[PDB]
A paper describes a structure:
The structure of the BHRF1–BidBH3 complex was refined to a resolution of 2.78 Å, whereas the BHRF1–Puma BH3 complex was refined to 2.0 Å resolution. The BHRF1–Puma BH3 complex showed a clear and continuous electron density map for BHRF1 residues 2–94 and 96–156, as well as Puma BH3 motif peptide residues 131–151. Similar to the BHRF1–Bid BH3 complex, BHRF1–Puma BH3 adopted a globular monomeric topology. The four conserved hydrophobic residues of the Puma BH3 motif, I137, L141 M144, and L148, protrude into four hydrophobic pockets in the canonical ligand-binding groove, with an additional hydrophobic pocket occupied by a fifth hydrophobic residue W133. Furthermore, a conserved ionic interaction was also found in the BHRF1–Puma BH3 complex between R100BHRF1 and D146Puma. These salt bridges were supplemented by additional hydrogen bonds between the carboxyl group of E89BHRF1 and the NδH side-chain group of R135Puma, and between the G99BHRF1 main-chain amide group and the side-chain carboxyl and amide group of N149Puma. The fifth hydrophobic pocket of BHRF1 is utilized by Puma BH3, where the structurally equivalent residue to Bid I83 is A134 or W133. The binding mode for Bcl-xL–Puma BH3 differs from that of the BHRF1 complex. A similar trend can be observed in BHRF1–Puma BH3 and KsBcl-2–Puma BH3 complexes, where BHRF1 shows nearly threefold reduced affinity for Puma BH3. The F72W BHRF1(1–160) AlphaFold model superimposition with the experimentally determined structure of BHRF1–PumaBH3 resulted in an RMSD value of 0.48 Å, confirming that the AlphaFold-generated structure was nearly identical to the experimental structures over the backbone atoms.
Numbering used by the authors:
A (entry chain A): 2 to 93, 96 to 157
B (entry chain B): 131 to 151
């Protein structure tokens, strides 16, 4: 019964724990507090999804780098523009598109938290934007039995 | 703008690629 916001946040937390010094950006701490985060980043569902997204990232490493750098350098309103991209992808859905979006969001969070020169507000509004935009998948995921069912049986 | 549309196009594409598996 976990929401997309919870699983994406847990994935971003897990990704940070296995990258850099393992410390969490204050933004991810906040999101976990404000989002009633019930899902552990070490949960098997999170670990299993993390591999799928990492595989998507590596297979499309350059495209993810290009798309993100084009996104973050041309935006004047980070969090709102995350919604715009989300709506364009899901014109209206498939498992591949869900995972493609989630991997792109995890990659963005990784890049933002790994570069110590990124301003706080850029990290803050990006994480908020991707988590709030991702809420649009709850309806579809619910009809597929939840994120746990998709990975454990599909 | 253009940037948001190009991103959406690429991610839809890569998605269809993973659906092919
Ligand atoms: Cl679930
Ligand atoms: Cl990894
Ligand atoms: Cl792929
Ligand atoms: Cl990579
Ligand atoms: Cl690269
Ligand atoms: Cl901004
Ligand atoms: Mg962990
Ligand atoms: Mg769609
Ligand atoms: Mg169309
Ligand atoms: Mg960056
Ligand atoms: Mg928020
Ligand atoms: N699907």
């Amino acid at each position: 019964a976990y929401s997309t916001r919870e699983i994406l946040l847990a994935l971003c937390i897990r990704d940070s724990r296995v990258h850099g010094n393992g410390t969490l950006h204050p933004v991810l701490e906040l999101a976990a507090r404000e989002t009633p985060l019930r899902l552990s980043p070490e949960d098997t569902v999170v670990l299993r999804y993390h591999v799928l997204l990492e595989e998507i990232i590596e297979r499309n490493s350059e495209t993810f780098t290009e798309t993100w750098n084009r996104f973050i350098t041309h935006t004047e309103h980070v969090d709102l523009d995350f919604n715009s991209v989300f709506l364009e992808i899901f014109h209206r859905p498939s498992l591949g598109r869900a995972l493609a979006w989630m991997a792109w969001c995890m990659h963005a969070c990784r890049t933002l938290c790994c570069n110590q020169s990124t301003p706080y507000y850029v990290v803050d509004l990006s994480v908020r934007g991707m988590l709030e935009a991702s809420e649009g998948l709850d309806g579809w995921i619910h009809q597929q039995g939840g994120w746990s069912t998709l990975i454990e049986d599909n | 703008e253009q940037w948001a549309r190009e991103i959406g196009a690429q991610l839809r594409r890569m998605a269809d690629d993973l659906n092919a598996q």
